[PDB]
Amino acid sequence: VARGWKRKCPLFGKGG
Numbered sequence: 527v528a529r530g531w532k533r534k535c536p537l538f539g540k541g542g
Contacts, residue, residue, distance in 0.1 A: 530538030 529536050
């Protein structure tokens with residue numbers, strides 16, 4: 527749910 531804050535610059539928006 528918080529992938530956007532995984533490590534540094536994750537793929538919060540894998541879609542587009």
